[PDB]
């Protein structure tokens, strides 16, 4: 369906006008469905904009401002959903599109297919050379009129004698089609003729070819496999014949305005829908490898707000005023973003720079559900020792195609992400880190969940330069690489380990403490038993049950330093197993027989 | 209001003397009949004015064996046909013969499913004047129609005021109004010959205008006057933030309408609908006082104790010696109970012995029934229903012949018992032909019922004069003579104190009997070690810590039977003190 | 060009070397002109070449 994302710049631009045109091409060329905004600003009058003809729908707003071109080639644009509005008011805004000191500017709109706007108003203002913005019945296009919708040029002429008088241009091929204000009284939606029989389906937005939920030009609410519907088919159907709720077949999962058979692995399954986070009345659980959510019991784990979610919905970066919200957090529900205005302060506002000591609050975070976006870091922090216990990131929200993004940090020489084990979805982008040494050693397919994931590495410190005249991975470290220097920064090791540190051998028969190898990670056995001499094994496994020799007496299967006497009494030998006492012992016990009660 | 229907088909009334009272209580003052509308075996001159309110029937309409000249259903607009008579017909008029003269169904414009069956009605004129194809629905044109021409009355000519001679009766007001066959478009229903007379796709039974608020009847769901295809969901999915969120406009689905909360006996389900049964892997939870909802099992669900009409017992006639053991240890039964002849007698064809009084004791633990309780036979050695004395609630979600939740027919009972019973959730109570039953007239039945359309119907029980002639009356120690039976245990509400489930005048504080301390309506014994002095505190309280005097081994902070083995021993005054050796 | 330079009290609006401009008339609204390395509505973050 050729989906692309909006720019979110508003009126601001690059200072070089040719690069502003080239960026517009890179964002929207060959795209059909725009998520976010369609924003066209400061384009020169000689530039070719015919690449915009493929656009069919815009989810946010359409903004056209300060341009010098004559014509908008948006002949296929049908619907503007308006789920974000310009200045929180306008879904379509067109203004100031002419040169103050010349004859250049916007002359015709070309918007013949534009049939509805679901939310917000229309703003047309000060377009000195624009014809046919007026004479358009904008109340047919806007779904919720407010008798917003401001319209305000001469010498444009009558459209054509054969036209109804509502028109986008200078000929009869540009006449506006009315679809809602010229209808039979019985209709809820829009029409394909003036008769009660040429009325179309209530769930279809911006016009129809026929009366069915298959026969629609664009859909509002959900697209169920080519039919447009109020909600996806559910796991149960109500039976008003019997007052019972009956199990249903063909039930589909709701996912981002589509109905699907399988919910993607990044999202939580809840009541036949895929969600980024579960509501506060319930708890997120995993069963059979599937993420899902069930009612909360006792005290449930809670995730903290990320940048762009919850109480931080308005935040652009971690900064000196919002960083305190992360002090006791173990999971972030949203993105974690570090921009220049957050790290070094924002003098236009009251927010000062972050003291590097404050960043230590993120040492308790194990999961980030959105992407990690690092574009600024304090001048002399040489690594990411903050996040050393971070386990997994991303896959529910991405920045473009990325879950991990590190741009242009010159003070950093190593990463040191000790605990990072998996990235559930999205790509990795690490560039321009001219002093970063270890990056070239990492085997990144061990962190990815699928064969569809990729990593972009370029323009960092040369791998041959740092290898020859710089730092390398520890001698115990495997071919999968290391995050930084030493025995505790390696992704996976040869020999053995204890905690985060890789080692040659595990003190099974030699040392002030004694262990059992237990596969790759070595563990201590119960200290109440003996530590063996002459190179002999101390324990066969964990617990007092697995000791090879005992320095004290015993009970049952194991070595025992103290037996539970005085409970009831129980007798113990100094060098043999403990014995049950004779009945009716009241002061102490010397054994299991009649004279042993003290 | 909304009322339910009988589903008796053509069977004889259980109590012919009270059949008109059953029909008046079920149908008086309601607009919508859920289930069937069944009017059968009515006597000559029966007063039927209470039927004039009905506009909608959700099942079929059955009119059979009646001796009335007319049935006042002229306001009826739509029959939905969600159940059909003999699996084929939505409207059936049978054997009404001195019999029905006219149908008079002036407002009827929709039959959504099934046919029309009219047979053996000698006096019934105007059966073959009606254009039945205008009444059947466009998408459900089964049209199975049987009409009987064998009329004994001479028909009066159809009024000249009726353009098509389509009379339902002799009056100028009896002319059929056509809503399908008179329009040139594809419109399911319309109000005139013009294209502008066509009305909204969701309207049924005709229209007063082109909008979805102009319907005479609603095809799918009536949203508080606005006619709609689905009830608004309680939870809505945000297409852009990928999260479920509450809907401030959301409604529960209930039958063919949308509501903000469901009626008293219905079980609320979290998907946005109200049901008589809970979905698989869910529990019933009384989350708030006076209501109930389904909640999901977080771990594998506990055993559910089923009764008659559900699961493996859904085809079973009655409780018998072959299946009674399945109720062992049950406090709540999901289903109904029925005790019939051949429950308390044998069946040589089923190799099954009769139930004994010692086997009925399996129900001693029972506190709640989800369906109905029907008893038409009972052992002659049991004077009451005391085997059900702990029964608190009969919900009535399933009713005997669609009408009765509590039924007692022809039994040897002297008094009802059932003293724990607090609620009859739904349905009528029917008690008749019990020649020895006395205390049915002293039970506070208006306290057990929970809405309109509920009543006690009774006949042929022991006359009140024969109860008084033998001194059979409520005990004096309880409110206003409200009793379930004779003696101090069968009182509803004691005026003083309750001891061992008996009402009593005195709370044993100063009496020669083993002494008891006072509570709000109850009396409880002193600890035996405490001295029974004449002071109101000295012996008295729920722990020895309240006692002031002690018979022996007195530990200064409280009275005990023996000094505890720090060890203690009794001193020269009989009080406990620490031992020199522990 | 329908734009003027913003006042010294508000020139801090643009970050990362961006220049601050105001629209000639009304409420009023502002824009930044970014260097070729930065984007966003007031030059908050980097341009990516992919
Ligand atoms: C994360 O959020 C918590 C709130 O949940 C914030 O608050 C507490 O912070 C302290 C210090 O960091 C945490 O650790 C403990 O601090 C105690 C300080 O003394 C105060 O608290 C005790 C509470 O009983 C009072 O008696 C006392 O008068 C003071 O008011 C120490 O007492 C604790 O250790 C010592 O005492 C215990 C006593 O059992 C001994 O076992 C120890 O050996 C030792 O001698 C301990 O250091 C504390 O847990 C937090 N409390 C809560 C409610 O959880 C954090 O500041 C906040 N920030 C982060 C990220 O830490
Ligand atoms: C923008 O407005 C245009 C009108 O200016 C609007 O119309 C589309 O026009 C194209 C042709 O330019 C139609 O093309 C279809 O292409 C297929 C495949 O080649 C053909 O099979 C179709 O033609 C036949 O079959 C149709 C079956 O329904 C018949 O209706 C038709 O008479 C032919 O026999 C057809 O040419 C295209 O179908 C229309 N659009 C629609 C919705 O019909 C276009 O919709 C507007 N832009 C957008 C993106 O909505
Ligand atoms: C002492 O050291 C032992 C190794 O030398 C430790 O290992 C063994 O641990 C198990 C318990 O985990 C003991 O009990 C047995 O448990 C298995 C469990 O079955 C499941 O796991 C195995 C793989 O481990 C898998 O093959 C199965 O399909 C199951 O999924 C049971 O099958 C047995 O019946 C039994 O209960 C072992 O006895 C024990 N090993 C030995 C040699 O005893 C042991 O835990 C250490 N500590 C102690 C207290 O013994
Ligand atoms: C409801 O969803 C269905 C998909 O489930 C939509 O149909 C799809 O429409 C897209 C539109 O881009 C089609 O992709 C296009 O295919 C043509 C093939 O010639 C190609 O030239 C375009 O570049 C583009 O890739 C896609 O094939 C089509 N899928 C199917 C199964 O027909 C449909 O439009 C949705 N309806 C509404 C009203 O939203
Ligand atoms: C980077 O890590 C990936 C895993 O994420 C490594 O891929 C693995 O490659 C080995 C062989 O080196 C595969 O094992 C076996 O290889 C033999 C041939 O030597 C073959 O006959 C067996 O059928 C089997 O494939 C292993 O399955 C494969 N894993 C995956 C998930 O594809 C890769 O080698 C690592 N690179 C380095 C140099 O660290
Ligand atoms: C010694 O090493 C063995 C492996 O060679 C360890 O046994 C494994 O222990 C892990 C937990 O550390 C078990 O996995 C987890 O089990 C939970 C059960 O609820 C499950 O939710 C997790 O997804 C995960 O599967 C693993 O099952 C177990 N393996 C076997 C065969 O039992 C053992 O823990 C080590 N002992 C010591 C002292 O460290
Ligand atoms: C949809 O359901 C609503 C109720 O939720 C129905 O509205 C009810 O309309 C009837 C008349 O058809 C009203 O009864 C009349 O009330 C007046 C009150 O002055 C009285 O004078 C009349 O004798 C008669 O009793 C009834 O009050 C009204 N209920 C409410 C709550 O407004 C409506 O008819 C249903 N629509 C369809 C198409 O079935
Ligand atoms: C029937 O049951 C009710 C409880 O449902 C019994 O409790 C209540 O008893 C009091 C006293 O007889 C009734 O009157 C009020 O008593 C308080 C006592 O402090 C007094 O302050 C008030 O001025 C008033 O006299 C009360 O109404 C009653 N409860 C209810 C809900 O009616 C009642 O004793 C039982 N009746 C018999 C005769 O068993
Ligand atoms: C109306 O009465 C006629 C008789 O007057 C019935 O018609 C008879 O039906 C039987 C059925 O076995 C045939 O054998 C006869 O030949 C029929 N007689 C005539 C005169 O046609 C008819 O069934 C009656 N209709 C109803 C609805 O009862
Ligand atoms: C509680 O009161 C009873 C009387 O109701 C007391 O018992 C009486 O004790 C006197 C002692 O001289 C005897 O003469 C009476 O014959 C007793 N009467 C009865 C009914 O037995 C008893 O002593 C009182 N107890 C206390 C703690 O004072
Ligand atoms: C390093 O950063 C700290 C932050 O407190 C600062 O005080 C110090 O002057 C910096 N030193 C250098 C050499 O960058
Ligand atoms: C290796 O990198 C260091 C970084 O300081 C640089 O001085 C040196 O010239 C580099 N050597 C080569 C061969 O590029
Ligand atoms: C019906 O009432 C009429 C008087 O209106 C009377 O003549 C007739 O006997 C009554 N029929 C019966 C069976 O009560």
Chains that touch C (3 or more CB pairs under 8 A): A
User: Whose Cα sits closest to atom 22 in ligand 9?
Assistant: B150
Residue A8 contacts residue C28 (beta carbons within 8 Å) = no
Contacts of A341 in chain C (CB under 8 A): 15, 44
Tell me, rounded to whole angstroms, the distance of Cα B54 from its chain centroid. Answer: 21
Residue B331, classified by CB atoms within 10 Å of its CB into exposed (0-12), middle (13-18) or buried (19+), is: exposed
Chains that touch B (3 or more CB pairs under 8 A): A
B65, B71, B77, B78: CA torsion to nearest 10: -10
What burial letters (b/e) apply to B525-561, b meaning 16+ CB within 10 Å?
Answer: ebbebbbbeeeeebbbbeebebbeebeebbbeebbbe
- d(CA A405, CA A399) in angstroms, rounded, equals 8
Could you write out the three-class secondary structure of A372-388? EEECCCCCCCCCCCCCC
**C23 in contact with A, Cβ within 8 Å:** yes
Strands A282-287 and A273-275 come out as: unpaired
- Find tokens 């000295």 and name the residue: B538
- d(CA A210, CA B387) in angstroms, rounded, equals 68
- d(CA B31, CA A283) in angstroms, rounded, equals 45
Q: Which two tokens stand for residue A191?
A: 């029409």
Contacts of A188 in chain B (CB under 8 A): 212
- d(CA B79, CA B135) in angstroms, rounded, equals 10
Contacts of A4 in chain C (CB under 8 A): none
* Nearest ligand to the C-alpha atom of residue A378: 11
Q: How many CB pairs under 8 A join A and B?
A: 81
Q: Tell me if C13 and A346 make a contact (CB, 8 A cut-off).
A: no
Hey, where are the domains in chain A?
1-178, 236-295, 303-469, 563-598
- d(CA A417, CA A491) in angstroms, rounded, equals 9
Q: How was this structure determined?
A: cryo-EM
Residue A555, classified by CB atoms within 10 Å of its CB into exposed (0-12), middle (13-18) or buried (19+), is: middle
Range(s) for CATH 2.10.220.10 in chain B?
235-296, 506-582
Q: Count of CB atoms within 10 A of residue A551's CB?
A: 12
Q: Tell me if C40 and A12 make a contact (CB, 8 A cut-off).
A: yes
Residue among A10, A15, A346 whose CB faces C34 most closely: A15
Range(s) for CATH 3.80.20.20 in chain B?
1-173, 311-473
Instruction: Kindly write down the DSSP assignment for every residue of A309-339, as one continuous string.
Output: SGGGTT-SS--TTTGGGGTT-SEEESBEEE-
- SS3 (DSSP) at B540: coil
Our answer on whether the CB atom of A546 is closer than 6 Å to any ligand 6 atom is: no
Hey, where are the domains in chain C?
3-46
Give the angle A469-A470-A473 at the CA atoms, nearest 5°. Answer: 130
Closest listed residue to residue A427, CA positions, set A378, A459, A394: A394
Q: What ligand 12 atom has the least distance to the C-alpha of A465?
A: 1
DSSP A105: B
- Strand partners for C46: C38
Residue A253 contacts residue A271 (beta carbons within 8 Å) = no
CA of A542 to the centre of ligand 6 (A): 13
Backbone region of residue B86 per phi and psi (left: phi > 0; alpha: psi in -120 to 50; beta: other values): left
Our answer on whether the CB atom of B577 is closer than 6 Å to any ligand 8 atom is: no
Our answer on whether the CB atom of B322 is closer than 6 Å to any ligand 8 atom is: no
Ligand 5 pocket: which of A449, A452, A480, A493 to mutate (most atoms within 8 A of CB): A480
- Find tokens 């386990």 and name the residue: A391
CATH level 2 (architecture), domain B1-173 = Alpha-Beta Horseshoe (3.80)
- Strand partners for A440: none
Q: Which two tokens stand for residue A282?
A: 């319930």
Q: What share of chain B is helix, strand, coil (3-state, %, to 5)?
A: 10, 25, 65
* Nearest ligand to the C-alpha atom of residue B254: 7
Give the angle B429-B416-B478 at the CA atoms, nearest 5°. Answer: 105
**CATH number for the C3-46 domain, one of 3.40.1360.10, 3.40.50.720, 3.30.465.10, 2.10.25.10?**
2.10.25.10
Our answer on whether the CB atom of A219 is closer than 6 Å to any ligand 4 atom is: yes
Residue among C31, C36, C48 whose CB faces A12 most closely: C31
**C16 in contact with A, Cβ within 8 Å:** yes
Our answer on whether the CB atom of A289 is closer than 6 Å to any ligand 6 atom is: no
Q: Tell me if B239 and A257 make a contact (CB, 8 A cut-off).
A: yes
CA of A326 to the centre of ligand 1 (A): 18
Closest listed residue to residue B81, CA positions, set A316, A423, A241: A241
- Strand partners for B306: B334
Q: Residues before each break in chain A (C–N > 2.5 Å)? A: 147, 152, 567
Instruction: Kindly write down the DSSP assignment for every residue of A476-495, as one continuous string.
Output: TB-TT-BSSSSTTSBSSBSS
The set of residues, in sequence order, having a beta carbon less than 8 Å from that of A380 and lying 6+ positions away, is: A411
- d(CA B77, CA B112) in angstroms, rounded, equals 11
Domains A236-295 and A303-469 share a fold: no
Q: Which fold has domain A236-295?
A: 2.10.220
Residue B324 contacts residue B294 (beta carbons within 8 Å) = no
Instruction: Kindly write down the DSSP assignment for every residue of B309-360, as one continuous string.
Output: TSGGGTT--S--TTTGGGGTT-SEEBSBEEE-TTTSS-BTTTTBPPP-HHHH
- SS3 (DSSP) at A525: coil
Residue A100 contacts residue A41 (beta carbons within 8 Å) = no
Q: Which residues line ligand 13 (CB under 6 A)?
A: B 44-45
Q: Which fold has domain A1-178?
A: 24 nucleotide stem-loop, u2 snrnp hairpin iv. U2 a'; Chain A (3.80.20)
Q: Tell me if C44 and A15 make a contact (CB, 8 A cut-off).
A: no
User: Whose Cα sits closest to atom 48 in ligand 2?
Assistant: A76
Q: Do chains C and B touch (3 or more CB pairs under 8 A)?
A: no
Q: Tell me if A240 and B280 make a contact (CB, 8 A cut-off).
A: no
DSSP A577: B
Ligand 9 pocket: which of B150, B151, B152 to mutate (most atoms within 8 A of CB): B150
**CATH number for the B311-473 domain, one of 3.80.20.20, 3.40.640.10, 3.40.190.170, 1.10.3720.10?**
3.80.20.20
- Resolution as reported, in Å: 3.3
Backbone angles phi, psi at B131, to 5 degrees: -85, 85
Q: What share of chain A is helix, strand, coil (3-state, %, to 5)?
A: 10, 25, 65
CATH level 2 (architecture), domain B506-582 = Ribbon (2.10)
CATH level 2 (architecture), domain A303-469 = Alpha-Beta Horseshoe (3.80)
Q: Tell me if A340 and C40 make a contact (CB, 8 A cut-off).
A: no
Our answer on whether the CB atom of A422 is closer than 6 Å to any ligand 5 atom is: no
- d(CA B464, CA A269) in angstroms, rounded, equals 66
Q: Tell me if A59 and B269 make a contact (CB, 8 A cut-off).
A: no
- Strand partners for B282: B296
- SS3 (DSSP) at A357: helix
**CATH number for the B235-296 domain, one of 3.40.50.720, 3.50.50.60, 2.10.220.10, 1.10.10.10?**
2.10.220.10
Q: Count of CB atoms within 10 A of residue B339's CB?
A: 19
The set of residues, in sequence order, having a beta carbon less than 8 Å from that of B354 and lying 6+ positions away, is: B321, B343, B344, B345, B346
Tell me, rounded to whole angstroms, the distance of Cα B251 from its chain centroid. Answer: 24
């Amino acid at each position: 369906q050729s989906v692309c994302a909006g720019t979110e710049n508003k009126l601001s631009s690059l200072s070089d006008l040719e690069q502003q045109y080239r960026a517009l091409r890179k964002y929207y060329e060959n795209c059909e469905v725009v998520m976010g905004n369609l924003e066209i600003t400061s384009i020169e009058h000689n530039r070719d904009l015919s690449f915009l003809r493929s656009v069919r729908e815009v989810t946010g707003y359409v903004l056209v401002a300060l341009n010098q071109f004559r014509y908008l080639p948006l002949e296929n644009l049908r619907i503007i959903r308006g789920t974000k509005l310009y200045e929180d008011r306008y879904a379509l805004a067109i203004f100031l599109n002419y040169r103050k000191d010349g004859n250049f500017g916007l002359q015709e709109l070309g918007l013949k297919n534009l049939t509805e706007i679901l939310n917000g108003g229309v703003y047309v203002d000060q377009n000195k050379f624009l014809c046919y913005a007026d004479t358009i019945h904008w109340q047919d296009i806007v779904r919720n009129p407010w008798p917003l919708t401001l319209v305000s040029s001469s010498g444009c002429g009558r459209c054509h004698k054969s036209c109804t008088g509502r028109c986008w241009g200078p000929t009869e091929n540009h006449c506006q089609t009315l679809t809602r204000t010229v209808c039979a009284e019985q209709c809820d939606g829009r029409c394909y003729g003036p008769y009660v029989s040429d009325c179309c389906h209530r769930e279809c937005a911006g016009g129809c070819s026929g009366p069915k939920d298959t026969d629609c030009f664009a859909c509002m609410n959900f697209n169920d496999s080519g039919a447009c519907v109020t909600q996806c088919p559910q796991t149960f159907v109500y039976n008003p014949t019997t007052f019972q709720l009956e199990h249903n077949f063909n039930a589909k999962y709701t996912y981002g305005a589509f109905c699907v058979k399988k919910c993607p692995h990044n999202f939580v399954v809840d009541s036949s829908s895929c969600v980024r986070a579960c509501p506060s009345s319930k708890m997120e659980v995993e069963e059979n490898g599937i993420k899902m959510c069930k009612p909360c019991t006792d005290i449930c784990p809670k995730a903290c707000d990320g940048i762009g979610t919850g109480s931080l919905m308005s935040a652009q970066t971690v900064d000196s005023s919002n960083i305190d919200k992360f002090i006791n957090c173990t999971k972030i529900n949203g993105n974690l973003i570090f921009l220049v205005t957050g790290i070094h302060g924002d003098p236009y506002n009251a927010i000062e720079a972050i003291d590097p000591e404050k960043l230590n609050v993120f040492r308790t975070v194990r999961e980030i559900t959105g992407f990690l976006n690092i574009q600024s870091w304090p001048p002399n922090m040489t690594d990411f020792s903050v996040f050393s216990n971070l386990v997994t990131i991303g896959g529910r929200v991405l920045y473009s195609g990325l879950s991990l993004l590190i741009l242009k940090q010159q003070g950093i020489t190593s990463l040191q992400f000790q605990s990072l084990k998996e990235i559930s979805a999205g790509n990795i982008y690490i560039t321009d880190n001219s002093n970063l040494c270890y990056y070239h050693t990492i085997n990144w397919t061990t962190l990815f969940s699928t064969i569809n994931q990729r990593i972009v590495i370029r323009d960092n410190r040369k791998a041959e330069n740092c290898t020859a005249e710089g730092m390398v991975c520890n001698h115990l470290c495997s071919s999968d690489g290391c995050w930084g220097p030493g025995p505790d920064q390696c992704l996976s090791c040869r020999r053995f380990s204890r905690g985060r540190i890789c080692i040659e051998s595990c003190n099974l028969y030699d040392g002030e403490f004694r262990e059992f190898e237990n596969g790759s990670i070595c563990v201590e056995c119960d200290p109440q038993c003996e530590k063996m001499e002459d190179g002999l094994l101390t324990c066969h496994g964990p617990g007092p049950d697995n000791c090879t020799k005992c320095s004290h007496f015993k009970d049952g299967p194991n070595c025992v330093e103290k037996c539970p006497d005085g409970l009831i009494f129980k007798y113990a030998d100094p060098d043999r197993e403990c014995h049950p006492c004779h009945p009716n012992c009241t002061q102490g016990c010397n054994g299991p027989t009649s004279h042993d009660c003290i | 209001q909304v009322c339910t229907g009988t589903d008796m088909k053509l069977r004889l009334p259980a109590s012919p003397e009270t059949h008109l009272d059953m029909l008046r209580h079920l149908y008086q003052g309601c607009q919508v009949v859920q289930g069937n509308l069944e009017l059968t075996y009515l006597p000559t001159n029966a007063s039927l004015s209470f039927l004039q309110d009905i506009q909608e029937v959700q099942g079929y309409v059955l009119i059979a064996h009646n001796q009335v000249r007319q049935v006042p259903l002229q306001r009826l607009r739509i029959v939905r046909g969600t159940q059909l008579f003999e699996d084929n017909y939505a409207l059936a008029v049978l054997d009404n013969g001195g019999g029905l003269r006219e149908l008079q169904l002036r407002s009827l414009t929709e039959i959504l499913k099934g046919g029309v069956l009219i047979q053996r009605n000698p006096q019934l004129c105007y059966q073959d004047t009606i254009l039945w194809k205008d009444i059947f629905h466009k998408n459900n044109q089964l049209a199975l129609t049987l009409i009987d021409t064998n009329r004994s009355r001479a028909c009066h000519p159809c009024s000249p005021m009726c353009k098509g001679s389509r009379c339902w009766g002799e009056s100028s007001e009896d002319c059929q109004s056509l809503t399908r066959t008179v329009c040139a478009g594809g419109c399911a229903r319309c109000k005139g010959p013009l294209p502008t007379d066509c009305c909204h796709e969701q309207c049924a039974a005709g229209c007063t205008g082109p909008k979805h608020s102009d319907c005479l009847a609603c095809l799918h769901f009536n949203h508080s006057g606005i006619c709609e295809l689905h009830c608004p969901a309680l939870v809505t999915y945000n297409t852009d933030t990928f999260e479920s969120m509450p809907n401030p406009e959301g409604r529960y689905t209930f039958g063919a309408s949308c509501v903000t909360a469901c009626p008293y006996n219905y079980l609320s389900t979290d998907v946005g609908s109200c049901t008589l049964v809970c979905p698989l892997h869910n529990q019933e939870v009384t989350a708030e006082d006076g209501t109930q909802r389904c909640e999901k099992c977080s771990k594998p669900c506990a055993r559910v104790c089923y009764g008659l009409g559900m699961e493996h017992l859904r085809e079973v006639r009655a409780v018998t010696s072959a299946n009674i053991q399945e109720f062992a240890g049950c406090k709540k039964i999901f289903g109904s109970l029925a005790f019939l002849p051949e429950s308390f007698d044998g069946d040589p064809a089923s190799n099954t012995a009769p139930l004994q009084p010692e086997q009925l004791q399996v129900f001693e633990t029972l506190e709640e029934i989800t369906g109905y309780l029907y008893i038409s036979a009972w052992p002659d050695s049991l004077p009451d229903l005391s085997v059900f004395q702990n029964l608190q609630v009969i919900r009535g979600r399933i009713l005997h012949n669609g009408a009765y939740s509590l039924t007692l027919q022809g039994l040897g009972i002297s008094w009802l018992g059932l003293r724990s019973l607090r609620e009859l959730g739904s349905g009528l109570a029917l008690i008749h032909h019990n020649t020895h039953l006395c205390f049915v007239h002293t039970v506070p039945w208006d306290q057990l019922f929970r809405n309109p359309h509920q009543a006690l119907l009774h006949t042929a029980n022991r006359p009140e004069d024969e109860c008084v002639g033998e001194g059979l009356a409520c005990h004096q120690l309880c409110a206003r003579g409200h009793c379930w039976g004779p003696g101090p245990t069968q009182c509803v509400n004691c005026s003083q104190f309750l001891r061992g489930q008996e009402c009593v005048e005195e709370c044993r504080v100063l009496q020669g009997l083993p002494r008891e301390y006072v509570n709000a309506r109850h009396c409880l014994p002193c600890h035996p070690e405490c001295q029974p002095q004449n002071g109101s505190v000295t012996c008295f309280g729920p722990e020895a810590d309240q006692c002031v005097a002690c018979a022996h081994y007195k530990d200064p902070p409280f009275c005990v039977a023996r000094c505890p083995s720090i060890w203690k021993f009794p001193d020269e005054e009989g009080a406990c003190q620490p031992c020199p050796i522990n | 060009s329908h734009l003027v330079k913003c006042a010294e009290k508000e020139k801090t609006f643009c970050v990362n070397g961006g220049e601050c401009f105001m629209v000639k008339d009304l409420p009023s609204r502002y824009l930044c002109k970014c260097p070729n390395e930065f984007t966003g509505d007031r030059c908050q973050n980097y341009v990516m070449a992919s």
